[PDB]
Each structure stands twice: as C-alpha cells, then as structure tokens.
C-alpha cells in the first residue's frame, strides 16, 4: 500500500514520501492516527498545496509521539518530577505529566497516559511505568525517576 507520510515515522520516511507500507500497518496504525494517508493521485495533488500548512505549522506544533507507542520509550521525556509515591512502586497514580516540565513546552510536545486503575493491585509486589500503557503487567518496568525520585 502506497502512502504519503504526514509526519515522521521511525523506519519509513520523514515529512512526505510515497512509502510502500503493508496494508495492515497502514489500515490499523498509520491512518487511524495522524501519521499518513493513502496516495490515490488526487490526495497527493491536494498534498502539494497542503504542504505549506503541514510542513510548518503542524510540523512545529507536533512532529513526535505520533501514536505515543515507541517515541515515548525512545525520546525520554517528563523525567523531571516532584511526586515520589509510597515506596517506589507506582500503582494507579497518574502523578504529574504536564506541570513541572520544561522540554515538553516548546513546539513538539510528546505526552503520556494513565495506568491500571485500582481493582486488584496495590503498593507492593510490582510497579508501573509513567508512560503510555496498554499492558500493565507484562509491560516494561523500567524506573522513570518518578516512582521514588
């Protein structure tokens, strides 16, 4: 499936390129998010005019964390914080993601999400990561300098 990239993707291209992406990836990830759009001739003929707004305004305001899946883990952000927690094992606490941050205030601004709500878990025997999470148990349990720092 040929698609033109509206934003930067990891290993496909950057800011406009007819990339041959697998149909499942395009259908389920790139187009449902604001990453790409298929090139059915007319679409690129509109893209060649849209590039003035896209490559400058949208590019400046948001060019990373297109789906907050891999950019959060790669481009470390929101490391500085003040809330500690209980003993070093985050569980159900959103904490702080916006306030007390400097890098995430200029142009491109990646973001994070919440964690598993309290129904079986508590402040011992495990931990959570301050980042986007779909899995909450098998997900990576790397320290984020927020659980105890």
């Amino acid at each position: 499936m040929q698609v033109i990239l509206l934003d930067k993707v990891a290993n496909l291209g950057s800011l406009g390129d007819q990339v041959n992406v697998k149909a499942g990836y395009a259908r389920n990830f790139l187009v449902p998010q604001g990453k790409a759009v298929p090139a059915t001739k007319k679409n690129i003929e509109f893209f060649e005019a849209r590039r003035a707004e896209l490559e400058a305004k949208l590019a400046e305001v948001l060019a990373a964390a297109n789906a907050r899946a891999e950019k959060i883990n790669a481009l470390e952000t929101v490391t500085i914080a003040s809330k500690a927690g209980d003993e070093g094992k985050l569980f159900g606490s959103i904490g702080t993601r916006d306030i007390a941050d400097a890098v995430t205030a200029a142009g491109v601004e990646v973001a994070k999400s919440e964690v598993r709500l309290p129904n079986g878990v508590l402040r011992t025997t495990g931990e959570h990561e301050v980042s986007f999470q779909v899995h909450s148990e098998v997900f990576a349990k790397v320290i984020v300098n927020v659980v105890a720092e």
């Binding site: 149909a23 259908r27 187009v31 449902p32 298929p38 059915t40």
Partner: protein, 77 residues
Amino acid sequence: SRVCQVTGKRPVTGNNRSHALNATKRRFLPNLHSHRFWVESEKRFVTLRVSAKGMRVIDKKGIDTVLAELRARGEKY
C-alpha cells in the same frame, strides 16, 4: 446472514467432485470479517461485516465512497 455489505458476496452452491467424479452439493462461503473502520468524516468507528475483497475495495475507493454506496443502497450500518 453471511453477506459482505461492501460487495454483496453470499454463500454460493456448487459441487464437491471426487476422483470418480461423484458430485455432492456444497457451499462456498465468503471470507467475511467484522471490522471497525475509522471514519474521519464523522470521527467515529463504523462496524461493518466485510469480506477481504471488500476490504481491498475500501482501501482502493475510500471508506467515504463505500459508505455513500451503502447508504444509497440502504444497508443500515
């Protein structure tokens, strides 16, 4: 019923033919899958029971054109 809402593919009757050319009636069913398509014109997920060929048709045409055809045909989605 096993009907693709994009293409209208139904089950179709034919023959299982043995090596002795024994013909026993059978059905060819389509490759139906219930899929949630992200429609941008309404910022929504629309569920449709679509074959793989119908999914290729959606990928080519655009979900807007396919849904326009569906609502011109009826087909409450």
